Amino acid sequence: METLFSGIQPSGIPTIGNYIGALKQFVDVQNDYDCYFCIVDQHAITMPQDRLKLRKQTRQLAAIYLASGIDPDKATLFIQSEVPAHVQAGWMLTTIASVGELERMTQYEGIPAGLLTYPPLMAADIVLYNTNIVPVGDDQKQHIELTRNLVDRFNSRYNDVLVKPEIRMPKVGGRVMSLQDPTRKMSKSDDNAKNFISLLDEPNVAAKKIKSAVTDSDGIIKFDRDNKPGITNLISIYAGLTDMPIKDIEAKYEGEGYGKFKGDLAEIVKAFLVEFQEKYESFYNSDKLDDILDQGRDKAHKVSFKTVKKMEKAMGLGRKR
């Protein structure tokens, strides 16, 4: 089984576009890949963070992942700071990185040093679990290139212990776009909140967002990205939440116009969110969430401890015992 590692920032709610694009996909591929979902609280404090909200946001992301169907027995869901191996391996790889390498990543009151020194810690996050694949976007290509180079450097200078990962998402979800700007990806931090549907949006608010999506006044329900990106995006969301094949959506709405389809889809979005948020609340407000995160932490520790031990031995840190 190939090992997958996804680092999750605890600084904002995934949208329905995030869920159709990755989360729902992870819920499937966790059966066929050894999956690591790391809530990277130590990467989050490289950026401005409010101390009193950060713990909450970390609990929210774990709750969202679990409510999506991320399964704590099949996968390893854990918080980064709770597994010391991350800053242990991250310091080790920082020593073999170069200032220039780190500086070129920042190009692709003072400037907080975490924004400069996080890339070796990201590399450590991945290789600690002998990761084969990382499902990241093109904005992280430099980070994986640095990771592979640090793995080559480490193995060549000390001895082969670390695994080079590849960027790879085993099952790419459909692309969901901004509801009032269908050429851009949907983003949780849009200034126009009608552009995204958050997984924690009020369900009624989210149906209104479907009704407010920018489309032609009417038309056929047909998939056509280039000419009708507005209705097409809506059809992609319909597909993502129902699992209806797109051609099967076209058949169901043959002879129907936008009013019927948008009304139906808004009810689908509403219903998905009512079900998702009830699962989300029951995870977020339960004592067992702390047990689940403890188990995840323990599983990540048992694997990365061996990795960090091999690294320390290879570099001559610590003691032979």
Ligand X SMILES: N[C@@H](Cc1c[nH]c2ccccc12)C(=O)O
Q: Identify the helix (H) or strand (E) that includes residue 20.
A: none
Please give the Cα distance from 277 to 225 (Å, whole number). Answer: 31
Residue 9, marked binder: yes
Give min distance, CB of 18 to its own copies, in A. Answer: 23
Under DSSP, the state recorded for 159 is -
Give min distance, CB of 215 to its own copies, in A. Answer: 42
Q: Using DSSP bridges, classify how beta strands 177-178 and 181-185 pair: parallel, antiparallel or unpaired.
A: antiparallel
| Region of 6-14, 108-116, 180-188, 272-280 interacting with ligand X (CB under 6 A) | 6-14
Give min distance, CB of 173 to its own copies, in A. Answer: 29
- Comparing CB distances to ligand X, the nearer of 127 and 234 is 127
Applying CB under 6 A, the site for ligand X has a residue count of 11
If 0-12 CB within 10 Å is exposed, 13-18 middle and 19+ buried, where does residue 287 land? exposed
Give min distance, CB of 134 to ligand X, in A. Answer: 5
Give min distance, CB of 255 to ligand X, in A. Answer: 45
Give min distance, CB of 131 to ligand X, in A. Answer: 8
Q: 233 vs 132, 190, 244, 263, CA distance in Å?
A: 32, 17, 15, 15
Give min distance, CB of 317 to its own copies, in A. Answer: 4
Residue 229, marked binder: no
Instruction: Tell me, residue by residue from 22 to 51, as one string, x for binding to its own copies by CB under 8 A and - for no binding.
Output: -------------------xx--xx--xxx
- Comparing CB distances to ligand X, the nearer of 198 and 233 is 198
Please give the Cα distance from 59 to 172 (Å, whole number). Answer: 26
Under the binding rule (CB under 8 A), the answer on residue 305 touching its own copies is: no
Partner that binds at residue 40, options ligand X, its own copies, none, CB closer than 5 to 8 Å by kind: ligand X
Please give the Cα distance from 95 to 309 (Å, whole number). Answer: 17
Q: Using DSSP bridges, classify how beta strands 76-79 and 3-8 pair: parallel, antiparallel or unpaired.
A: unpaired
Q: Which residues pair with 78 in a beta bridge?
A: 38
Please give the Cα distance from 321 to 319 (Å, whole number). Answer: 6
Residue 178, marked binder: no
Please give the Cα distance from 73 to 81 (Å, whole number). Answer: 21
Partner that binds at residue 181, options its own copies, ligand X, none, CB closer than 5 to 8 Å by kind: none
Under the binding rule (CB under 8 A), the answer on residue 97 touching its own copies is: yes
Please give the Cα distance from 269 to 204 (Å, whole number). Answer: 9
Pick the binder of ligand X from 34, 41, 125, 201 (CB under 6 A).
125
If 0-12 CB within 10 Å is exposed, 13-18 middle and 19+ buried, where does residue 222 land? middle
Query: Which residue reads 């969202």 in tokens?
Result: 64
Residue 302, marked binder: no
Residue 186, marked binder: yes
123 Cβ contact partners less than 8 Å away, ≥ 6 residues apart: 90, 93, 143, 146, 147, 150, 151
- Comparing CB distances to ligand X, the nearer of 120 and 230 is 120
Partner that binds at residue 1, options its own copies, ligand X, none, CB closer than 5 to 8 Å by kind: none
User: Binding site residues, as ranges?
Assistant: 9-11, 17-18, 125, 137-139, 176, 185-189
What are the residues binding its own copies (CB under 8 A)?
A: 41-42, 45-46, 49-55, 58-59, 79, 81-82, 84, 87-88, 90-92, 94-102, 109-114, 116-117, 120-121, 158, 290, 293, 312, 314-321
